[PDB]
């Protein structure tokens, strides 16, 4: 069985996700409009990413144990993980019907071409879509989804981490919760090697983070493109 502490961890992570992920996508109306007709989708997608960063932070602050870290380490973990958690949380809007992120209306349905119109190439987008399909195919329980985001954030091996032992301690508590959850609550056959597959997804995310970082560096180096970003994106991802 799940211990009471493990049940507690899951309850808190579910609530945290519900408080930071609006499945109606109502706030998207506040973003600069999408334009499809260069880099025409950069203002909209920069605003989507900026908003998403704010939400990833709100979720992270609620991870049991996250508060016990120094603000320095909190910063390092959030800076390094932001794009990966956005990629993870985006799986909720992703649909394999047509390989797109469907956020409720034609205006807010993003396909491969929209992402390339934010300054990105297939070198990133092809593995990104393959990641999204592989992740969908795991048919994760919401419980597993929120634990995986939490484990993603509290990763002791991120560059610049000071108290790695404490970060590892918090991550182990989440990892063990996830393994026990799978054992007790995820029935076979769907549970077959499920934890190892979830961890492989974290590995894939590191490669996606690297390639995104490379393409973002190149994008943002052009002052006309960085003019289109937000102050939070520049602070988190880089300002040339």
């Amino acid at each position: 069985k799940l211990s009471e502490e493990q049940q507690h961890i899951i309850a808190i992570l579910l609530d945290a996700h519900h408080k930071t992920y609006d499945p109606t996508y109502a706030d998207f109306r506040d973003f600069r409009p999408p334009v499809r007709m260069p880099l025409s989708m950069l203002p909209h997608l920069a605003d989507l990413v900026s908003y998403s960063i704010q939400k990833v932070i709100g979720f992270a602050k609620m991870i049991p144990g996250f508060r016990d870290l120094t603000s320095d380490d909190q910063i390092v973990l959030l800076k390094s993980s932001a794009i990966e958690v956005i990629m993870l949380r985006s799986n909720q809007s992703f649909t394999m019907d047509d390989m797109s992120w469907d956020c409720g209306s034609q205006d807010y349905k993003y396909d491969v071409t929209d992402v390339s119109k934010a300054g990105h190439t297939l070198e990133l987008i092809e593995p990104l879509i393959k990641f999204q399909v592989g992740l969908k195919k795991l048919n994760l329980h919401e419980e597993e989804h929120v634990l995986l985001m939490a484990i993603c954030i509290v990763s002791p091996d991120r560059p610049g981490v000071q108290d790695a032992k404490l970060v590892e301690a918090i991550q182990d508590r989440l990892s063990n919760t996830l393994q026990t959850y799978i054992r007790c609550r995820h029935p076979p056959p769907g549970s077959h090697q499920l934890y190892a597959k979830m961890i492989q997804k974290l590995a894939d995310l590191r490669s996606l983070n690297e390639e995104h970082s490379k393409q973002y560096r190149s994008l943002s180096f052009q002052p006309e493109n960085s003019m289109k970003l937000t102050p939070l994106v520049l602070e988190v991802f880089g300002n040339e």
């Binding site: 932070i57 602050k61 603000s71 910063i75 959030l78 800076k79 602070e235 988190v236």
Partner: peptide, 12 residues
């Protein structure tokens, strides 16, 4: 590094 916005959002 100076991350005033991230720092602000992290506040309790």
């Amino acid at each position: 590094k100076n991350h005033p916005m991230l720092m602000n959002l992290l506040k309790d």
